[PDB]
Amino acid sequence: MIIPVRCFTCGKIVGNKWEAYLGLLQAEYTEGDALDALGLKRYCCRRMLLAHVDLIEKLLNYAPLE
Amino acid sequence: PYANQPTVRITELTDENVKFIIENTDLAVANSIRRVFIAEVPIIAIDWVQIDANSSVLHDEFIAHRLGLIPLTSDDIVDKLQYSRDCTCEEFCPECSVEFTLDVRCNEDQTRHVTSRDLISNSPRVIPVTSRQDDILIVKLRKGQELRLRAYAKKGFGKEHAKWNPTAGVAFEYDPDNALRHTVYPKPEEWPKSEYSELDEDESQAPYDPNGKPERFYYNVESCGSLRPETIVLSALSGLKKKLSDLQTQLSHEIQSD
Amino acid sequence: CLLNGLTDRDLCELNECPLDPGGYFIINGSEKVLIAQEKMATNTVYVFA
Amino acid sequence: MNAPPAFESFLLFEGEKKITINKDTKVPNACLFTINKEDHTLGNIIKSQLLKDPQVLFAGYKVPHPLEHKIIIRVQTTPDYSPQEAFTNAITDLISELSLLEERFRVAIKDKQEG
Amino acid sequence: FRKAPPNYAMKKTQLLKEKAMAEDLGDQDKAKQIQDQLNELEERAEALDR
Amino acid sequence: QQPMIYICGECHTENEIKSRDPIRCRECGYRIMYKKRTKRLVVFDAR
Ligand SMILES: [Zn+2]
Ligand SMILES: [Zn+2]
Ligand SMILES: [Zn+2]
């Protein structure tokens, strides 16, 4: 529902990289290049950004008030 | 009938990871230092979260869980603080803990991004990693929601929980050529040469070596950002030395009592 | 139904998600679904032995 | 619901001894050291150090059960060298070695930074 | 006195307006209901975009 | 002196509801309303 804070297997902080990864994908980069541009060497930490689903948006659509 | 004279040589020192080499030491010592790197390294981290008003879309415990995982720079504070369990006072005293406060409320129309930068610490030096590269996203708030809480941090080590795990990933590897045959390749040609392999590209693996002991352990400790890597190594060495010292004292007392 | 051809905006505002397949009744506040039963086709001659 | 707390793996409980010596009877000069609230970290290195010592005929540790935080170290020396002093010597030299390693690592770092 | 659109009844208000327009056979009432529904939809779209 | 404040379903407006009273929002008028968080010492361990 939200990007984790750390890679389950490794432990490297990955939570602070979701917005950057999205920006890099948006401008021109491709995933395979954006991932190493952020500095994710081990394939264990890449699954965090590739596989992660972003449901928090759908959750925010149900605004309590206004 | 005594110990050995290990040597050390750093190959790559940065503010993010350290790659060094240890020579003339036993495998047990190397792997033990590794396990101390991962498990027994003092570090600060959030451990007590009191939530006063949480109107976000995530659970109450989700916020505390995430806040448990945000690293905190402890370069010179972990050594000074004392474990809360061994403190001699009630409530989280500043001498034995670091307090945190967070109070955000999405008023404008655009969705907020409550990042670690909202964690206003009382102490100057104990802050999340934002000094010098976005910040750890905690939760997203929408107009009308709010999140008020305060949490305290305390010293622990990875063995108790992962939050106290300073190292991202320790790359430990010795004898890059399979000279001691500790592993048997069914088809050696099919395997790629190790980064530390001195062997040329023709031969697949070094010839067997009967009278050969493991030396030249290669380390690639990688700090998560809480402590500096060389600081992790120094703390691990000091902690292991202390554990041995305590054990020796206990054994001495036991023998004397007998 | 009240959500016949309704945009995802209104669905979200009605505390419902656009992904819900639907096609299930609400009795006493429980989602009831009818299992498709099967039987022998009618008006067809079968010769069993 | 019955998950034990995380502090039971390293913190001693009131009344439990950190280290207990128990002489064995099957062979002369053989003792079993029992350590509470420890793991392979603090047993494997001692095992190796005891192996280095030539006067130590047998040396080995074990973990009775992973869920239990306890280890047993068995040591058997020549008749003229009690296992207690073997253990003390092993720990003393191991501490000396780690201190020397720390000093060398520190000097290597301080030289690596602009040097 | 309290205006209707505020704040969570946008979809309910739109459905009510559509139902009233469908029920009403008058042309002027139908046009007014359609215009009100279109205005409500536009306001909701603007709020969502913001 | 606690009148057991409630939160309207869709208005998200507070209401003062006492015993032996209908459950409705002060305005519009709906039949759904949730309670407000306790005031107790909700303390979690970030474990
Ligand atoms: Zn990973
Ligand atoms: Zn204190
Ligand atoms: Zn009402």
Swiss-Prot record, chain E:
Intracellular or extracellular location(s): Nucleus, Nucleoplasm
Superkingdom of source: Eukaryota
Residue ranges the record marks as coiled coil: 25-50
Oligomeric form and interacting partners: Component of the PAF1 complex, which consists of CDC73, PAF1, LEO1, CTR9, RTF1 and SKIC8; the association of RTF1 appears to be less stable than that of other subunits. At least in HeLa cells a N-terminal shorter form of RTF1 is also found in the complex. The PAF1 complex interacts with PHF5A.
Domain comment as written in the entry: The Plus3 domain mediates single-stranded DNA-binding.
Function as written in the Swiss-Prot or TrEMBL entry: Component of the PAF1 complex (PAF1C) which has multiple functions during transcription by RNA polymerase II and is implicated in regulation of development and maintenance of embryonic stem cell pluripotency. PAF1C associates with RNA polymerase II through interaction with POLR2A CTD non-phosphorylated and 'Ser-2'- and 'Ser-5'-phosphorylated forms and is involved in transcriptional elongation, acting both independently and synergistically with TCEA1 and in cooperation with the DSIF complex and HTATSF1. PAF1C is required for transcription of Hox and Wnt target genes.
The name this protein goes by in its record: RNA polymerase-associated protein RTF1 homolog
Source organism: Homo sapiens
Name of the gene this protein is made from: RTF1
Complete-protein stretch covered: 502 to 551 of 710
